[PDB]
Structure formats: C-alpha cells, structure tokens
From a paper:
We found that H5N1 A/mute swan/England/053054/2021 NA (mSN1) expressed at ~380 mg/l as a tetramer with minimal aggregation, exhibiting high enzymatic activity and a high melting temperature. To assess whether loop grafting influenced the local or overall structure of the NA, we determined high resolution crystal structures of mSN1, the N1/09 hybrid, and the N1/19 hybrid. Analysis of mSN1, N1/09 hybrid, and N1/19 hybrid structures revealed some variability in active site conformations, with the greatest variability existing between the cavities of two msN1 molecules within the asymmetric unit of the crystal, reflecting different trajectories of the B1L23 (150-loop). The msN1 structure revealed differences among the protomers of the tetramer at the active site entrance. Within the same tetramer, protomers with a relatively narrow cavity (i) combine with protomers showing a wider entrance (ii). This difference is dictated by the trajectory of the B1L23 loop (150-loop; dark blue with yellow side chains). The variation in trajectory between (i) and (ii) is most pronounced at Val149 (red surface). While the scaffold is structurally conserved across the three resolved structures, each possesses unique active site conformations, which are primarily influenced by the L01 and L23 loops surrounding the active site cavity. All NA proteins were immunogenic in mice, generating binding and NAI antibodies to themselves. mSN1 elicited NAI antibody titres against itself that cross-inhibited viral N1/09 NA. mSN1 showed sufficient cross-reactivity to N1/09 to protect mice against virus challenge.
Author numbering:
A (entry chain A), B (entry chain A), C (entry chain A), D (entry chain A): 59 to 469
Write the structure that this text describes.
Amino acid sequence: ADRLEMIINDNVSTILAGGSGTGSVTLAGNSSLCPISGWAIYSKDNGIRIGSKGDVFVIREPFISCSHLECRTFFLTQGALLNDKHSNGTVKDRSPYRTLMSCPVGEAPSPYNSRFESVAWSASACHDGISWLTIGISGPDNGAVAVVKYNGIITDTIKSWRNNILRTQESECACVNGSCFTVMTDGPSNGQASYKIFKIEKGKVVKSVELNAPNYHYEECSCYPDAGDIMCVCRDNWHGSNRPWVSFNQNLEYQIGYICSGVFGDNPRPNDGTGSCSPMSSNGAYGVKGFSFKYGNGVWIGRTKSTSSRSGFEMIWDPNGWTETDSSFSVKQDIVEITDWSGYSGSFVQHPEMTGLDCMRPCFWVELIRGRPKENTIWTSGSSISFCGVNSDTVGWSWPDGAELPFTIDK
Amino acid sequence: ADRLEMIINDNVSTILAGGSGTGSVTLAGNSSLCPISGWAIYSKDNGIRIGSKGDVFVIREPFISCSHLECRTFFLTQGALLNDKHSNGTVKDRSPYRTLMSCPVGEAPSPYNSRFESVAWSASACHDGISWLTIGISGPDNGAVAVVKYNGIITDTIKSWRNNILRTQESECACVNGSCFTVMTDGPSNGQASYKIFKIEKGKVVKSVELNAPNYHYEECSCYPDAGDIMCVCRDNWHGSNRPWVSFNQNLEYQIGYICSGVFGDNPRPNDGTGSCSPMSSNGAYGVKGFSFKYGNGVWIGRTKSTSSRSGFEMIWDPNGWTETDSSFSVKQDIVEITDWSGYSGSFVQHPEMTGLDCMRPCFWVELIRGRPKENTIWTSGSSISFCGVNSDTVGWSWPDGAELPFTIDK
Amino acid sequence: ADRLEMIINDNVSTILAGGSGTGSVTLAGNSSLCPISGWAIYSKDNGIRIGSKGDVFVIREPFISCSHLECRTFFLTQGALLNDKHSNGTVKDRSPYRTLMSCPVGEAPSPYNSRFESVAWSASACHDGISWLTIGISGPDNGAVAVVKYNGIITDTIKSWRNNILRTQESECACVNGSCFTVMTDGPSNGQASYKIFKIEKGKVVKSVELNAPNYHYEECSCYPDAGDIMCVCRDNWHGSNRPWVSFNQNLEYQIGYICSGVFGDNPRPNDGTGSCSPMSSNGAYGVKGFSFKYGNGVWIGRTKSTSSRSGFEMIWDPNGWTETDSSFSVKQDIVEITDWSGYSGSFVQHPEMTGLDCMRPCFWVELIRGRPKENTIWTSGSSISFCGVNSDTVGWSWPDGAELPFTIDK
Amino acid sequence: ADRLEMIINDNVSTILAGGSGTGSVTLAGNSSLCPISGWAIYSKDNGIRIGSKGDVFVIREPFISCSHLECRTFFLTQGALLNDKHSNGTVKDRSPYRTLMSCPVGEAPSPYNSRFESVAWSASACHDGISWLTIGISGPDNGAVAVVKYNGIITDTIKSWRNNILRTQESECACVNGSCFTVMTDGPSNGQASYKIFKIEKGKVVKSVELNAPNYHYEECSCYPDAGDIMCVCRDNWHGSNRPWVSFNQNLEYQIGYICSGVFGDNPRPNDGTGSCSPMSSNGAYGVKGFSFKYGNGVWIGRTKSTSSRSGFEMIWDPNGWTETDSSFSVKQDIVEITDWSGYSGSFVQHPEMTGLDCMRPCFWVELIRGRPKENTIWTSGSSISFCGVNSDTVGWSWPDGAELPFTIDK
Ligand SMILES: *[C@@H]1O[C@H](CO)[C@@H](O[C@@H]2O[C@H](CO)[C@@H](O[C@@H]3O[C@H](CO)[C@@H](O)[C@H](O)[C@@H]3O)[C@H](O)[C@H]2NC(C)=O)[C@H](O)[C@H]1NC(C)=O
Ligand SMILES: *[C@@H]1O[C@H](CO)[C@@H](O[C@@H]2O[C@H](CO)[C@@H](O[C@@H]3O[C@H](CO)[C@@H](O)[C@H](O)[C@@H]3O)[C@H](O)[C@H]2NC(C)=O)[C@H](O)[C@H]1NC(C)=O
Ligand SMILES: *[C@@H]1O[C@H](CO)[C@@H](O[C@@H]2O[C@H](CO)[C@@H](O[C@@H]3O[C@H](CO)[C@@H](O)[C@H](O)[C@@H]3O)[C@H](O)[C@H]2NC(C)=O)[C@H](O)[C@H]1NC(C)=O
Ligand SMILES: *[C@@H]1O[C@H](CO)[C@@H](O[C@@H]2O[C@H](CO)[C@@H](O[C@@H]3O[C@H](CO)[C@@H](O)[C@H](O)[C@@H]3O)[C@H](O)[C@H]2NC(C)=O)[C@H](O)[C@H]1NC(C)=O
Ligand SMILES: *[C@@H]1O[C@H](CO)[C@@H](O)[C@H](O)[C@H]1NC(C)=O
Ligand SMILES: *[C@@H]1O[C@H](CO)[C@@H](O)[C@H](O)[C@H]1NC(C)=O
Ligand SMILES: *[C@@H]1O[C@H](CO)[C@@H](O)[C@H](O)[C@H]1NC(C)=O
Ligand SMILES: *[C@@H]1O[C@H](CO)[C@@H](O)[C@H](O)[C@H]1NC(C)=O
Ligand SMILES: *[C@@H]1O[C@H](CO)[C@@H](O)[C@H](O)[C@H]1NC(C)=O
Ligand SMILES: *[C@@H]1O[C@H](CO)[C@@H](O)[C@H](O)[C@H]1NC(C)=O
Ligand SMILES: *[C@@H]1O[C@H](CO)[C@@H](O)[C@H](O)[C@H]1NC(C)=O
Ligand SMILES: *[C@@H]1O[C@H](CO)[C@@H](O)[C@H](O)[C@H]1NC(C)=O
Ligand SMILES: [Ca+2]
Ligand SMILES: [Ca+2]
Ligand SMILES: [Ca+2]
Ligand SMILES: [Ca+2]
Ligand SMILES: [Ca+2]
Ligand SMILES: [Ca+2]
Ligand SMILES: [Ca+2]
Ligand SMILES: [Ca+2]
C-alpha cells in the first residue's frame, strides 16, 4: 500500500507538471547519430512572402530546437515588422531592442504566434527533456551579460570576461543526461579571441573551461550530442575558410581541430582543392554560421554554392572529409540554387525520447536572407527551411525564399 | 497490488500522452456507413470574404480530416496572402513555396491560426486514433518525393517510381485498425499512368501494390473506410466522365471499376444519358476531384451542376447507380447554385470513436474557387463548405463563396 | 481492490475528457436565483473601436453563455470584417454567408480568436456541464433547417414546420439536470405564428410541445433556469409593447403570460402608464430582443431608455411588476445614456458548479448597435457589454460603444 | 484502502483543476527577499515599435504579476489601437471604454493575444497560488465601484466611500497564506485624502482598515510580500518628493512612514541632498508611480534620472537609505538613458513556489511612455521593460522604447 501511495503521488506530480508541458525524464543523449543517405525536407515558413502583407517580424538567425513534445523556431528580432518604417536597418545588430523569441516550426514569425524568450542580441536555446534552457546576451559591447533562464525563470548570468562582445551559438545548445552545454566567445572577430565551453544544469552554470586554442577562432558554434559527448562545428571569422570544431565529454575535457576536407565549408572560401587540418588562410577572413555532422572519418557538410557570396546551399557527404584533405566527395544534394540567396545555417537533433528511434536524428536549418546589403531595401530579414536526415529515398531541388523585392516600405 | 500498479502506470501514460492530444486506442474502422436521408451543413469558412481585409492564405484543396478530438481543414498554400502581390499566380501549382497546413474547421486560413504540416505541392492526411499521419509531396517533376510524418516526425519517404509527377489524394487517407491507406499516381495525366495503393503503420510504409488497371486512370482519390475495407472514388483525367473507383481490404487485395450510373459525376461531362461501367470517353478528358459514397448498388454522387465548368454543386442519391447505367435517380439536394463557382470536393468520415454512433458517418467538403482563370484577377483561391449525412430532415439551398471580385490588388 | 480499479478507471476517463474541456457531471439547475441589489459590470469588448483598424468581424447578437470553465460571447457574422467592402449591408440578415461563432468574453470578435460553431442566420447555444450544445438555423425562408450539434458533432436537425422562417432565441438555451431547453418560432412576425418548446439531451431532441397561445407572439426568447424550471421572457413583434413570457418544467408542461408592469419593457413602446397582463397593443408592433428576471411578484426589467428608438439602457427593479399593472418601481440603475445607441439584450446565468455559490447567478448582456439604418454607413455591427447581479454595492453610469463613425470604408 | 481512495480522489481533483491552470496549494509568502547584487533584464515587448504596423493596443500601466505557472503583463487600454483614429487622446484617463487586460510577458499587447480581465480605469491583480484575483475600478468620479473577481467570477464589490475618485495600485497586489492585500485611495490628489488597506480571501473582502495618516498621501502603491508581512512603497502626489510607505501584517496592523534617503525617489523632485522621514515638500506636488525594496535599513530605489520629467531610469542601492537622510549611495545601475522617455514603474515578486528558491525574488517593471503631452502626437501609449534581481554579475545600459514618432495617424 505504501508502494501504491508512492507511485500515485509521483505519477500525479508528473501529470501536473506535464499539464504545463514540463517533462519528467531527462534526455539520455547517449545514442549515436542515425545512419542516413540523404535529407528529407521538414519545414518552410515562407516568412518574408507572408510578411509582405501579414504582420511578420523582421528576424535573423531562425534556429530550431526541439523538446520531447514539439520543435520550435527561435529567432532574434529588432522588435519591428516587415513593411514598417521601424524595419529600417540603421540599427546595428547589437541593439537594446533585439529579443530572442520562438514560434512553431513552419509558421511565419508573428507577434500573434511568437512567445517571448529573452532580451538578446546573441542567443542560444535547448531542452533537457524537462524544461527549456534559454541564453540571451544583451548589454554594451564592453560588458555584455548573458541571462540564463530555465523554464522561463532567470537562473544564472554570465558576464563578459574580455569586455569585447560576449557572443554565443545562434543555434541550439546540446543536452546530455540532464546537463546542457554551450560555447561562448569573447574578444576580436578579426584576430585571436577567447573561447569557453559551459556545462549548465537546471539553468545553473556548474562548470566552464577556456579552450587553449592558439591560432584557432571559434564563433557561432553548431553543437550536437553524439554517444554522450558533444561535437561543435563552428565559424573561423579570423583566417579560416574551413570550419573549426571542438568536441568534449560531460566533464568538459575537450579536443579541437579543423575539418580537413578540401571541400571547404565556410563562405567566403577558395575553390575546392587541397584542404588542411589547420586554418585555411586563403579567403579565410569573415565567414558564415554553418554546421557539419561527423560520421567516423566522413563528414556531412552543409555549405553555400558560391565561394564569394551567401548564395545557394548544398549538402555534401565526404566519406573521408573529417581527416583527409582531398577535395573529392561521394554525394551532393542540392538544397538552394546558386541563383538564390541563402545565409546562416545550423544543426539540430531529434532525440530518441521524441522520435522513438534507437539513434540520434540529425537535422539542419538554413536561413534565406533578403534585403540589405545586396538588395535595394531599407531592411534585412530571413526566412527558414529545414531538413532531417533519413535512410530512405531523397531528392535535390531548390527551395528559395521567394519574395519579390523591394517592398512597399522601400519606395 | 501488481494489477493496480500496472493499471496506474498504463493509465498515467495514457493521461500524459492525452495531454498533447495523442490518443491511446486505434480507430477500429469496422463499422458500416450510417443510413442517411440527406446532408446537414457542417461548416463554412467565408475565407475569401474575410481575406479581402484579414490576413488569409491564398489556398487550394481545403480538405477536412478528423481525429477523435477535432476536425481540421488541411490545405495547400503558396505562402502568400490574399490582396498581396505575392498572390500573383504566375507560380505554377508545383512550386518550392507550396506547403500543407491546417486550421480548425470553419475558420479562415490565416498565418495566425494555421499549423504547419509539411512542404508539399501534393498532399494527404488522416488520423489513426493515436496521432496524425501527413503525406507531403514536393520536389522536381522527374523525381518528386513524398515525406511521410507521424505525429510531426518524419517516418518515411516515397520517391517517384515513374519520374512523371508523383501525386496523391488531396483529401484524407483512410485508417482501419491502426493501418492507414492511400493512393498515389505517377505518370501522364492525359494517358495511361501507374497507380499504387499504400498501407502505412505509424508513418512507415508496410506494404504497397501497383494496380493492374489497363485503360483506367486514377487521380486525386477520395478514400473512406467501410466495414474494415477501403473504398476510393477518384478522377479519370484521361478519358472518363464517370468516376473511377478502387476498393481494397487491409492486405491491399483490390477491386477496380467505374461508377456505372448515367448520372455522370465528373466535370467536364456529357449530358445525362446511358452510363457505362467502363471509361466514358465523351467529354472525358480533364476532370475535377470528386467523391461518391456506395450503399449496396446505390450511390450518393456529389457533382457540379454544369457539364462544362466548375459551377454549382449538388448531391444525388441514385439507388442503383453503382451498378446500373440508367440516368434516373431518386433524390437531389442542391448545395451550390449553378450561377456560382464550385470546384474540388472530397469525402471525409467521422468514426464511432468520435461520434458515439454505431456506424461510420459520411461527410463531404466542397471547394469554392474564385479568381483565375475565369475571373479577371491575378490570383486564384478557394473557400470551403462542408456537410455531414444525417438520417433526419434536411433542405437544399445555395451556400456560395460570396466574395466581390476583383480585389484591390487586382487594380 | 475491485473498488480501487473501478475508481481509477472512472477518474482516469474523467481526466482524459477534462483534457479537452469536457465535464463529467451535469449542471443540476435546481437552485433559485441569487438575491441581488444591483448589477456589477462584467465585460466590455470595445469591438467596433478596435475594428476601426484591427481585423474584427461585423457581428450581430453577441450573446454570452457559460460552461463550468469559461464564459464565451457567441455571435452571428456575415463573414465580413469592419472597414472592408464586404461589410456592405445589402445582404439581408438571412444569408448563406452567416455563421454562428464564439470568442472569449471581453475580446473583440476576430477571425484570429473566434471558434466556428455552425452555419446560421438564427442561433442558440448553451452548456449542460459536459459539452456545448449549439443550434444553428440556415436555409431558405420556406424550409429553414436548424442543425443541432453536441460537442461539435451534428446530433439532430429540426426543419421548419410552417415554412415561414424558422427562428430561435439569439441567446443561451437553458440546461437543467442534463436536459437543455429552447424555444423556436415559425410563421409571421406581424401576426399569429406557431411557437414550440424543445427538450434536448446530448444534442438529441427528446421532446417538443407546441404552445396553445392564442393572441400571443413569441420571438427571440431569453430563457434561464430557476429551481428546476425554465423561464423565458421574449419579444412580441406583433402587437405587444410589454414582454411575453413562457415558463415550463422538465416535462414541457408550461404556463404563459405577459409582464403586467406599466414599466413597459419592449421597444418601441408607449410612455409608462397602466400596464396589462395581456398584449399591450399601443406601439406594440415591432420590438427588440430583451430579457427580465422574475423574483416572486417582482421583476428586474432591462430596457432601452427611449420609447421609440434603440437608445440607452437601464435596469429597473419593480417589486410587484410581474403581476401588477402600476408604473411605479423601486430602483433604477443606468447602464447606457439615452444619447447613445443600444440594441438587443439578453440574459445568461452562472451556475453553482461554476461560481461556488448556493444559488443561480443572473447576468445580462447588451448589444450596442452602430451603423445602418440610423447612421450614414454601409455596414451595421454591434459591440457588447455585460453585467452580473450582486448583493453588494453597485452604481449606474453609461458604458456606450464609443466608435467614431463613419469609417474609412464609408467614404 | 480507504487512504488510497482518499488520495486518489483528492489528487484527481487537483489534476482536473490543474487542467485549467488552477493551483491546489496557496503561496506561503513567509520567505524573505533574496540577497541580490544587481538586476538582470527579464523582458522587453517593443510594443509601440511593433504597433506602428501591427494591431497593438494603446495602453498604460503595463504591470506584471506572476502565478505558479506564468508571468503576465496586465495593462489598461482605452479599447483603441496604435495608428488608429480612436487612439486620439481627448478621452480622459477615466472613461467607460477603459479595460484591464493581460498578455504574456514580453509580447506586444494585441487583441489577438490579450485576455480580458475587467472593465477598469484603475486596477490591481495578483495570484494566491490557486486562482487570479483581479480588481477593476470603473464608474463615475463621485461613486466609482471596484469589481473584485476571483478566477474570472465576480466575488465582491467595493464602492467609493469619499465620492472622490476611488483608485488603487496599478500594479500587483500581495498574497500571503491564501489572503491577498491591496491599498485603495479615495479623495483629493492635491491634498489630504483617505487611504484604506484591504484583506481579500477567494475574492471576498474579509477585512479593511483605514490608515490614520495625517499629512501623508498614498497613491498607486507598489506592494510586495516579505516574511509574512506586506510592504507598500507608494506615491505622494500632494507634497512629497520622497516616497511614502505602509507596511502591515496579515491582521492589517500597520506602520507608516516616508523613505528617509536624500536620494529622492519621486518625479518631479529636488536635486539630491538632505532627506526627510517626513514628506519632502520641495517639488513634492505631483509624482509618478514607483517602487522600492527594503533590506534592513537599506533600500533599492528605482527612479527616473531627470528631476523634472519622466526621463531615464536607474536602480540605486542605498545601504542606509530607509532610515538615514544622507544622499550617499553604494551602487547605481543604469536602466534607461536620461535622453529617453520612461514613466510608471512597479515591483513584482516571484515566489518560491514558482522559482524553487528558498527566498522571495524581487523584480520590477518600467513603463516607457511615448506620445502626448511631450511629443506631437494625438495619442499616448507605453511599452514595457522588466528586470529581476540576481546575486550574480549584472550590467547597466539603456533599453529605451525605440519608436520613431510621430506615426502615420498623426499626419
Ligand atoms: C533609414 O535610416 C537612416 C539613418 O537614420 C535615414 O537617413 C537619415 O535621414 C535623416 C532624415 O532624413 C537625416 O537627418 C538629416 O540630417 C541633417 C544634419 O545636418 C539635417 O540637415 C536634416 O534636417 C536631417 O535631420 C540623416 O542624416 C540620415 N542619415 C544618414 C546616415 O544619411 C534614412 O532616411 C532612413 N531611410 C528610410 C526611412 O527610408
Ligand atoms: C504577375 O506576374 C507576371 C509574370 O511575372 C507579370 O508579367 C510580367 O511583368 C514583368 C514586369 O512588368 C515583365 O518583365 C518585362 O520583360 C521585358 C523583357 O523584354 C522587359 O522589357 C521589361 O523590363 C520587363 O522586365 C514580364 O515579361 C511579364 N511576364 C509576362 C509573362 O508577360 C505580371 O505583371 C504580374 N502581374 C501583376 C503584378 O499584377
Ligand atoms: C453597397 O451595395 C449596394 C447594392 O449592391 C450598391 O449599390 C449598387 O451599386 C451597383 C454598382 O454601382 C449598381 O449597379 C448598377 O446598375 C445599373 C443597372 O441598370 C447599371 O447601369 C450599372 O452598370 C451598375 O451595375 C446597383 O444598381 C446598386 N444597387 C442599388 C440597390 O442601388 C452600393 O453601391 C454599395 N455601396 C458601397 C460599395 O459603398
Ligand atoms: C482629436 O480630438 C479632438 C477633440 O475632439 C479634435 O478636435 C475637435 O475637432 C472637432 C472637429 O474638427 C471640432 O469640432 C468643431 O467644432 C465647432 C463648434 O463651433 C464647429 O465649427 C465645427 O463644425 C466642428 O464640429 C472640435 O471643436 C475640436 N475640439 C477641440 C477641443 O478643439 C481633434 O481634431 C482630434 N484630432 C485628430 C482626429 O487628429
Ligand atoms: C510513477 O512513479 C513511479 C515511482 O516514482 C516511477 O517509477 C514510475 O516510472 C512513474 N510512472 C510514470 C508513468 O511516470
Ligand atoms: C543510454 O542510457 C539509457 C538510460 O536509460 C540506457 O537504458 C541505454 O541502454 C543507454 N544506451 C546506450 C549506452 O547505448
Ligand atoms: C488503464 O490501464 C489498463 C491496463 O493497461 C487498461 O486495460 C485500461 O483500459 C486503462 N484504462 C483507461 C481508462 O485508459
Ligand atoms: C469492431 O471492432 C471492435 C473492436 O473493439 C469490436 O468490439 C466490435 O464488435 C466490432 N464491430 C463489428 C465487427 O461490427
Ligand atoms: C472517481 O470515480 C468514482 C467511481 O466512478 C466516482 O464516484 C468519483 O466521484 C470519481 N471522482 C472524481 C474526483 O471524479
Ligand atoms: C439540487 O440537486 C443536487 C444534486 O446533487 C442536490 O445535492 C441538492 O440538494 C439539490 N438542491 C436543492 C433541491 O435545493
Ligand atoms: C494527494 O492527496 C493527498 C490527500 O489529500 C494529499 O496529501 C497529497 O499532497 C496529494 N498529492 C498531490 C501530488 O497533489
Ligand atoms: C513557510 O511556511 C511553510 C509552509 O509549508 C513552511 O514549511 C516553512 O518552513 C515556512 N518558512 C519559514 C517560516 O521560514
Ligand atoms: Ca572564415
Ligand atoms: Ca574526400
Ligand atoms: Ca474526366
Ligand atoms: Ca439510376
Ligand atoms: Ca413589440
Ligand atoms: Ca410596480
Ligand atoms: Ca510627489
Ligand atoms: Ca545613504
């Protein structure tokens, strides 16, 4: 009878928490990436097309993160709407008006369907199986502060340790066994900076270590869990046209490197050729947020089709690209035509607790940027597409943004 | 005590799943169609009237499917809104912007009330009593791919086997005993093509068979469950003004034919006369998505009132129309005046697990198309009406779209 | 142990149904009306003011009905929005576009917050403690059909028995002990017609009786439960400036009469004077939907302040007004200034299962009509206010609509 | 077995109530304020920027109150939208159109996301752990009535006892042990008035006491719970540039005073100098709603940066400011630049039942007012920011409103 009273009370508390969407069992995060052959399209929001008339936020960085019940598109907005004068982009990215918000995947980002997450001009978010963790960085450049919320309640803060634009992933953090992990950068974007990895439990930073990474540069990391460890594929904005990466276990014991493949993943970049396991200096300054998925010595690379502009997008399976420097690959899947605009891209995963699979499902999102600087508008925004890897038949195509620019507000 | 612990745990898991709207018992699908005498109006969304000022999607194919808790209108949109320049219809139906989405029955389809389902220029959706199954076909004409989601998670893919526009129902699939069934077509729309029927469990294709149907043509099938089997009434776009049909059991053992009644159900069509159990060649090319309900040798036929254009709509009970070729019928119920536009129509059912009845309730939806090609606008959209069969008093009338064209965007 | 298994299963089913908002215990409806002294304001939606820019339905008859969890404003819309050309009122009230929908009390009626209920140009709705009952009448004047839904599922139909505009309450029906009751009228509005009262259980009409009421006229009845019986105060559109009423028990055994007070409750009406327990012919043709609450021989009367137009609104407690013909009363509470527009008004109740009280709480809603015919617009709409009776301090004031006419669409 | 049946029934009732968001255990309110070092930003809605095109209410007083599940922004609106002619502010604050409504924290206040709370031109709201208590004052100046709702149901009324504008907090009331407490004022705003404190249980006023406070003036009190008592920091609109305060226990046994610090907290105010524990007459007439948090003899003061206009905002920790009159302080945290508009501000708390902490978390909100009287518009509205105190690293900055005035409606 005591056993029954215990089970009843515990299950009742689980039911009461579940009424609010709060889980009861942490995501294990110990399964490996699923074997896949290609990418099946998951979502397209048509945000800018709809925003030509609907009330849609002007957004950037529409990254996706999933709980055990839903997948959401998180994004940063300047608190302005498309086709409104406040969309005039003479506000620089880091502003007091910028906020991290979220809406259901596939829906246009509107004030009528978007939940508020935090005040942020740089952000990260993930779900540990119980509640949502959100990290939002706001403040001055010389003393930015990341506010860390768990289930909407402020649980911690992280202040800049270099006083030079504290900034983080702009995609989902990675959660394993009830601890979530993220990467933050403080310092120059055109030179050596400082990079730290953080272990956070129930929204409280329980550990951090600074990477000893001379001549490396980490920004806007795409991190995913795999077999109980974390892999982050990032952006070298200093002097690398191949992508830097850092992996670590749950105790923040890490390894670092660069993707060796001659199929260079950053943008801008040189033409394909001999790759390097060190920073590739040629056209290596600047970059774009990106991702890659590691399968042994092979790598799935998501990259633009252009070597010079954020145009086009493609998935490339290079079965030796993680460790070897040749420019040969096996499979290419077209995602966006080179004649059309792309932009930031990131990874996200679907855990077994959501899918029912015995493996970690990889997925990715792509931001389709319209407006300034390449188009004659007063604004810059992005719509989103997203794909998940499957071990079944797929096809390549082009799913571009589709909006007709300039808008009414631009004339 | 062990029995109590088992019941508690299982019912608690049912409660936790039900919190997300996820059922626990599959729909049986073994009851027969309810005896009815007429059709009681169920819904009207006034989509285009509202969209004259509100933010409403330009849509097509507003088909309805029901779970055990709700009925939803699924639809395909080009990601544009009424009275916006992106509604300009020089995008052909099969575009990378087209998406399958859903809203509550009776509501205007808006970005503020519509859930995203999939990227699709051809679609199907149903509910097995536990979760929603969605099928969305996107991609190039020579290699289209259907993404199959169960509870929002990609569970399978189906690639074109003829490289000639893989395409499916544009209405609800049919679920019996935990297996859902659909029909897909690959090949020409003006000649012999290939037709396959699929059995899908938890979003995974567990069986498929290709119909041996020489001189038949199947497109845009309206399928419903009845007594543990499936009946599909479809569209012969090749050379049939009567409608083709295919029925099958849960092992995909099938029968095929054409509705024999001289009350021809397709559009365009000849005037009523002697029917055929074979394809009726006269005015048989082209067509419109439609449905019919079989009661023994009799048939409830939903059809346009015009023989040449998608104008008007009417329900006709022909007590021998499934097998006999005479043009006589018993009952006609007016739905839309011939002076007003109609369009696609489809069937949907309400299962005993939703209604509390001991039989399968038949219902149908009708799409009221406005805009191009017959009206001087830049856009084409559709509103919806829906009726359910009852064994009580009914009446005929005309419930047309009601919008005043052209809109502001057209001048 | 068998007792525990039974309790667990039954409570689990109650929990699963409650997840959808479906109750488990019927409203008793056997308590008497609460003793009150005045009316405390409950809601104001400012619908037309907000609709000057927001996307708000052009509506009529915004009646309120409450479940055990919420109170909703039901209304009829022509499927058009304020400040849109489709709001042009050359559509007569009875149209195929008119629909019964509902939104939360106090909110402006928008396509983004309104649930679809039924297709209807005349309507009624109530809640029996388990599910919502909706009655929506649509169709031609000579054969209108009321579709009766329970929990959103069509459960019955009622066809016109006189072929002369079947029409019903335009306010909430009354539910007692699991049976809900309504009144419908078929026949002329300027002469003797037919009046029927209906007893409906789980959406199925289980009984109906036709009133033997020579020289009486019933339209647009406001019905409420009291002590296990039903009282309806209605509108004599034929030849009565006092209001007709009909009361009945759960077996539809009824009594009829007219409110005897010289404080005449209809509009138009003569000046106050000697009342009648028979139809008051003077200025008795035409009318307005209204209500009254009976307390022994006294009556709470809600009426316009003008004797000729739908202007102003006031509550009047006449402690002998139900049976005596004098024009004297005790208390008057101002609701809307006579310089401002009013319109339809109706009663609604809050049951003990919702309030926690030991009595039936009376409340009422008032429709504030703007537009045609008295104002120079192309449209006619109404906003709503609502009050509930309390036995505590209250005050009179004027809470008018507040919109500035004409709107942009009118020029 | 009887114990099991009791536990099952009680937990089932808790589950059924929790399905509607209704709690089962009252907030204790006996913990002390958390030790903090600074303020981490919690929210920013960008209301006016978004309302330049979106459908956003013109609002005032956007105060925040939290339950055990969510935090909401309550606000008063005139039932008009930004950039609509009805936003013309020749309606004085106290109007029959004004309503108290609420939306999720951080979201722009829209008719599509705002719940209706009450009709009110003065308001208060809080949550006792079970249900929401709302107090809305409407009516004429000489007989205003506060309607008191608990869980949306009218539970009490409070009529003006001085017939001179009954008015209350415009921020959250304070709840301890199932009793909630508020302060109301009746009488002049430029002279001695009457001030009452109210104890309310389940929406019923169970006690009230009138303060014997000669030469004091209380308006727009910000009240918070601390260690089982209530502290209110208010506004002296008569003759005080320092803020008045009143504290009391659950039996309404009270103490009164003024904040002694020479860091004057009201606006307008003199320059910092020698403070007073009595009303500071210099520049003491008029004022602004504000707050302060008491920590022993020290005080956290939120105030404007300007001494003359509602411009700028800053948090100041004065470790002896509650009792000592010196103008020295320890810490200042910038919130809004003095070059930018601020306005009303208030406190709100997050209880242990929401946070999981062992202490009472203090937070505050700030209203950023745009429009009349200082800007050349026809309207006046406010957006909101909010911060919570943390014992971790923070930073000062300026998070202003950000809208570009005048709007389209103003030309
Ligand atoms: C988008 O924002 C930019 C930056 O605010 C706008 O350009 C700015 O336009 C303003 C007003 O036209 C210019 O101000 C002018 O400055 C001079 C100072 O001597 C004075 O003569 C004028 O009275 C006026 O205030 C401002 O200089 C200009 N900024 C820059 C960097 O050129 C731009 O117009 C906006 N675009 C839109 C709304 O489409
Ligand atoms: C709806 O879409 C159609 C198709 O895009 C629009 O018609 C197209 O209009 C464009 C721009 O007016 C035409 O482009 C023109 O082409 C010639 C090429 O020699 C050049 O002289 C001009 O500079 C211009 O770019 C385009 O030809 C035309 N397409 C067709 C098939 O006629 C149509 O205007 C749209 N309707 C709207 C927005 O109401
Ligand atoms: C609101 O609706 C009414 C009724 O539809 C509108 O009045 C109608 O306006 C139309 C078009 O202006 C008139 O049609 C005209 O009829 C004659 C037939 O001989 C023909 O000469 C013209 O070509 C034209 O089609 C119609 O007669 C008229 N109806 C009535 C009863 O007068 C009214 O304009 C609408 N108001 C708005 C949109 O503000
Ligand atoms: C915002 O509201 C104010 C107050 O209602 C508006 O000012 C008012 O404008 C009206 C109409 O223009 C004026 O009425 C005029 O009054 C005289 C009476 O002799 C008459 O000659 C005219 O026929 C007219 O009706 C009214 O006096 C004026 N009120 C005040 C206090 O000056 C104001 O225009 C509104 N602003 C907007 C809509 O931008
Ligand atoms: C119910 O509670 C017991 C004891 O805490 C736990 O082991 C079990 O997993 C819970 N069951 C569910 C379905 O949550
Ligand atoms: C992952 O952890 C879970 C914890 O429940 C365990 O059941 C499972 O076997 C583990 N899988 C591995 C180690 O592959
Ligand atoms: C509870 O669980 C038992 C055992 O699995 C099952 O037979 C029963 O139907 C469940 N009851 C409900 C109401 O779901
Ligand atoms: C349909 O299947 C259900 C399964 O629970 C069964 O109870 C019912 O009798 C069946 N009805 C038939 C075969 O008509
Ligand atoms: C649980 O079920 C029992 C048996 O059916 C019933 O008497 C009881 O009222 C139910 N309890 C609740 C809280 O619904
Ligand atoms: C009303 O009916 C309920 C049914 O539960 C009963 O408990 C109550 O005493 C009745 N009240 C009366 C007759 O006043
Ligand atoms: C369940 O009910 C018991 C008895 O009323 C109560 O003590 C206990 O706290 C409840 N448990 C929960 C989790 O609400
Ligand atoms: C506050 O009251 C709660 C009531 O459950 C009690 O457990 C706790 O110890 C109290 N805390 C104090 C007095 O600090
Ligand atoms: Ca680079
Ligand atoms: Ca290679
Ligand atoms: Ca055909
Ligand atoms: Ca026949
Ligand atoms: Ca009359
Ligand atoms: Ca009297
Ligand atoms: Ca002052
Ligand atoms: Ca000091």
